Amino acid sequence: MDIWPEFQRDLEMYRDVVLSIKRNLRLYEECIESLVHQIGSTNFDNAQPLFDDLFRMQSELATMLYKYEYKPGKRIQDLIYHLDRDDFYSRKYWHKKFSDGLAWPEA
Amino acid sequence: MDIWPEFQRDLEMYRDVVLSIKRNLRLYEECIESLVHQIGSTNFDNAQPLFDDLFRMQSELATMLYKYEYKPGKRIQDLIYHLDRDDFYSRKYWHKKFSDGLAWPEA
Amino acid sequence: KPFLLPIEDVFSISGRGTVVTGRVERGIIKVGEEVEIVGIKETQKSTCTGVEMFRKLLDEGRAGENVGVLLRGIKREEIERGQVLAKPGTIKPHTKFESEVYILSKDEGGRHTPFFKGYRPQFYFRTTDVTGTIELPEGVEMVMPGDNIKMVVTLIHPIAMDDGLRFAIREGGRTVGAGVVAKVLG
Amino acid sequence: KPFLLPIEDVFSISGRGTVVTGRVERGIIKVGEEVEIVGIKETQKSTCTGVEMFRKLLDEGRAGENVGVLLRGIKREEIERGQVLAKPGTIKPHTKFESEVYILSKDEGGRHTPFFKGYRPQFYFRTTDVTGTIELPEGVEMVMPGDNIKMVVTLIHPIAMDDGLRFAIREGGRTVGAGVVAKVLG
Amino acid sequence: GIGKKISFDGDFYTVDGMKFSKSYYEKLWEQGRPAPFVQAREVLNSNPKIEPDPRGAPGYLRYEGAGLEMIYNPKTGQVGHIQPVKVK
Amino acid sequence: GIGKKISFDGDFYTVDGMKFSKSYYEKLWEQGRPAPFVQAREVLNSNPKIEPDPRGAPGYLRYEGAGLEMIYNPKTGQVGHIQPVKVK
Numbered sequence: 001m002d003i004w005p006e007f008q009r010d011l012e013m014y015r016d017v018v019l020s021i022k023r024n025l026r027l028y029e030e031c032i033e034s035l036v037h038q039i040g041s042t043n044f045d046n047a048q049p050l051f052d053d054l055f056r057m058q059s060e061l062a063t064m065l066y067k068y069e070y071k072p073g074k075r076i077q078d079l080i081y082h083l084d085r086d087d088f089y090s091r092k093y094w095h096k097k098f099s100d101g102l103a104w105p106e107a
Numbered sequence: 108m109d110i111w112p113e114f115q116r117d118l119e120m121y122r123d124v125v126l127s128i129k130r131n132l133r134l135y136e137e138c139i140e141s142l143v144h145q146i147g148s149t150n151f152d153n154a155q156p157l158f159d160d161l162f163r164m165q166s167e168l169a170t171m172l173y174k175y176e177y178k179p180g181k182r183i184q185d186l187i188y189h190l191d192r193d194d195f196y197s198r199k200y201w202h203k204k205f206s207d208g209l210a211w212p213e214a
Numbered sequence: 215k216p217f218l219l220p221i222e223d224v225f226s227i228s229g230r231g232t233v234v235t236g237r238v239e240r241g242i243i244k245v246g247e248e249v250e251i252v253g254i255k256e257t258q259k260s261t262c263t264g265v266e267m268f269r270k271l272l273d274e275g276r277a278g279e280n281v282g283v284l285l286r287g288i289k290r291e292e293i294e295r296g297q298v299l300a301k302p303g304t305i306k307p308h309t310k311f312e313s314e315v316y317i318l319s320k321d322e323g324g325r326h327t328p329f330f331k332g333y334r335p336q337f338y339f340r341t342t343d344v345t346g347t348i349e350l351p352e353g354v355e356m357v358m359p360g361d362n363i364k365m366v367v368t369l370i371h372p373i374a375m376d377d378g379l380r381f382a383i384r385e386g387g388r389t390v391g392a393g394v395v396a397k398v399l400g
Numbered sequence: 401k402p403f404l405l406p407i408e409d410v411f412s413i414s415g416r417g418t419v420v421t422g423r424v425e426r427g428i429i430k431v432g433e434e435v436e437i438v439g440i441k442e443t444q445k446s447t448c449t450g451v452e453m454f455r456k457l458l459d460e461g462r463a464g465e466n467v468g469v470l471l472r473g474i475k476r477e478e479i480e481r482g483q484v485l486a487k488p489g490t491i492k493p494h495t496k497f498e499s500e501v502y503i504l505s506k507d508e509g510g511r512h513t514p515f516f517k518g519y520r521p522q523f524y525f526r527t528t529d530v531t532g533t534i535e536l537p538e539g540v541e542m543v544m545p546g547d548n549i550k551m552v553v554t555l556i557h558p559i560a561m562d563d564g565l566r567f568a569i570r571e572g573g574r575t576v577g578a579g580v581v582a583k584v585l586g
Numbered sequence: 587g588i589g590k591k592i593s594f595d596g597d598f599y600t601v602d603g604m605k606f607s608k609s610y611y612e613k614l615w616e617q618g619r620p621a622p623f624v625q626a627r628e629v630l631n632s633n634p635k636i637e638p639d640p641r642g643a644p645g646y647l648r649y650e651g652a653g654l655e656m657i658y659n660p661k662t663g664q665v666g667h668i669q670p671v672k673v674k
Numbered sequence: 675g676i677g678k679k680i681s682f683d684g685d686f687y688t689v690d691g692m693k694f695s696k697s698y699y700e701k702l703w704e705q706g707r708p709a710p711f712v713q714a715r716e717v718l719n720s721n722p723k724i725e726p727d728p729r730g731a732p733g734y735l736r737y738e739g740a741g742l743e744m745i746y747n748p749k750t751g752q753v754g755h756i757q758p759v760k761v762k
């Protein structure tokens with residue numbers, strides 16, 4: 001018959017959930033800016049638990065992108081790409097860059 | 108503390124609602140294709156209640172775009188633009204175009 | 215038993231197709247076999263160009279753990295959760311069916327009030343919810359929480375189904391009933 | 401009384417700014433006046449370059465019908481529902497407050513079970529929901545549906561607020577409690 | 587620049603020499619396109635591109651500016667239609 | 675082209691001369707990037723662009739093809755990392 005009434009309900013739900021997701025994304029963004037800062041201000045050994053938190057966050061943001069298909073702002077998309085690989089060799093690279101004053105991941 | 112668990116809940120809700128909205132959009136698309144066809148196969152007077160349905164649908168799709176900020180596929184976006192204006196003069200124009208074989212609104 | 219995989223998730227990879235995942239319900243899927251994608255949209259055919267069963271098999275999948283199936287030429291917008299992959303010609307999409315349903319009591323987490331002929335709930339099949347309308351049997355004006363009821367259902371989008379298919383009835387995300395497809399109609 | 405408009409909806413128009421709507425809570429807003437956008441994000445200032453009160457006024461808005469306010473230079477992503485427009489310096493954002501709360505009974509549509517110290521519900525202020533954590537008072541280990549309770553709340557995002565501000569407590573979209581801001585803290 | 591009352595005669599809402607039909611005015615707020623007088627004024631103040639109404643409604647012209655397209659009767663002040671421009 | 679068993683030795687999952695560590699393998703399915711052997715095979719069969727690992731992990735190379743980038747050890751067959759290419 002007429003689908004508009006249930007469609008409106010869904011649309012209102014869409015508006016509310018997106019509002020909430022964007023807020024959550026702002027917190028991830030801030031928390032990551034701060035981890036990057038901390039990592040860049042300490043030595044490599046002491047940075048490992050900080051990297052563990054940083055990559056754990058990236059992993060969750062990757063789950064958002066690929067499992068649930070929420071496409072975030074370019075900044076967070078670039079972050080999800082650049083920080084996906086998590087091993088000794090990527091950590092060595094990012095630690096160096098963040099120590100030299102890099103505030104957000106980029107090539 | 109850790110926002111991931113509530114974030115996942117929101118993300119799952121996002122996935123479910125978007126899935127549903129896209130389905131609803133498919134029905135609007137089909138119903139509109141059929142109204143356009145009917146309008147193009149009848150005379151101007153008999154097309155008026157058909158245009159009333161067509162513009163009523165466009166109005167709902169416009170509410171989706173502007174009130175709830177759901178951005179649909181290009182096809183539906185073009186439709187929302189081209190069919191926004193609803194008066195005697197736009198009806199005269201669309202009736203003519205649809206009678207000559209236009210299957211979907213476009214300039 | 216003919217192959218059937220309800221689609222849970224979809225992952226697109228540029229220029230090679232789309233990977234769909236789910237738990238195989240019956241049968242076996244092997245690389246190179248043709249499959250149909252049934253439900254919600256018009257049926258389509260495609261070929262597996264890759265299969266993986268989580269921790270167990272490459273190029274074949276069976277009931278049990280999750281299976282990912284790579285479909286060549288299928289783009290993201292052409293496939294959706296709630297469809298099924300199936301051996302061609304073994305399952306069809308339908309919108310209208312006779313059902314046997316149990317409506318949950320309030321104390322079971324269901325509805326508080328009875329519903330009437332204009333009830334438009336969601337019907338959950340395998341991996342997805344679809345809105346449908348109902349036809350109560352003759353002389354029945356209302357269905358009380360806690361009743362069994364035979365009803366005719368008309369979905370607004372087709373679902374791959376056969377007689378015996380179980381479903382849940384849902385409102386706002388909560389389960390308010392459970393049913394079985396008695397007889398497919400159209 | 402200083403101007404306050406909780407933001408419901410936002411409509412962006414290219415090259416001129418963004419129109420925000422809501423119902424004026426108190427005061428008057430006139431074209432050309434400076435305003436602050438308070439809550440959720442860091443505070444920002446801007447100027448009304450247009451005001452319309454639905455069916456009543458152009459370039460001024462008052463309590464009553466909806467008001468649309470055109471803010472020059474504010475782009476869509478810089479403003480959100482749940483913020484407020486306010487006369488500069490008259491309201492501030494906070495995350496931590498003492499509250500007096502009534503928890504709904506089950507029969508009132510609320511919770512079935514009591515909650516404990518790790519309860520993370522949503523707190524609804526004016527037009528939006530914000531997650532927060534709680535600190536129960538000394539010796540209280542659980543709060544039963546149907547209780548009054550004084551609790552300390554910490555929101556995960558700031559909200560424009562003053563003492564006396566009412567709010568709802570929500571879980572999954574349903575109201576489970578109602579409260580008032582007793583004392584703002586930080 | 588102070589508060590100007592919007593007048594209503596049963597058929598139109600009017601202010602500052604602009605007017606909207608009752609139903610079109612209400613429809614715009616209802617659909618999430620609020621403050622139609624503010625929108626139309628933006629167009630009029632944007633050095634808009636002005637052409638004849640392409641659909642040929644008598645007295646009407648098409649104005650384009652400030653991100654919007656409007657169909658407007660400079661004699662009566664009536665805004666017959668206003669919406670955002672087509673997105674590329 | 676028939677069913678090939680995936681072997682597990684406690685540390686790695688292996689099949690068709692490819693291998694993934696236990697945790698990386700599970701992580702990919704869990705994060706919504708299923709069928710990692712199928713993904714890696716697509717890369718290997720896409721005439722990929724092959725270069726040294728830019729991060730310098732020993733034995734590893736960077737392969738790019740089929741919409742993906744992979745860090746892969748042609749001697750051991752280990753896929754150390756695989757993800758979609760950067761979106762422009």
Ligand SMILES: [Cl-]
Nearest residue numbers: 632651652653
């Ligand atoms: Cl302009």
Ligand SMILES: [Cl-]
Nearest residue numbers: 720739740741
């Ligand atoms: Cl390629």
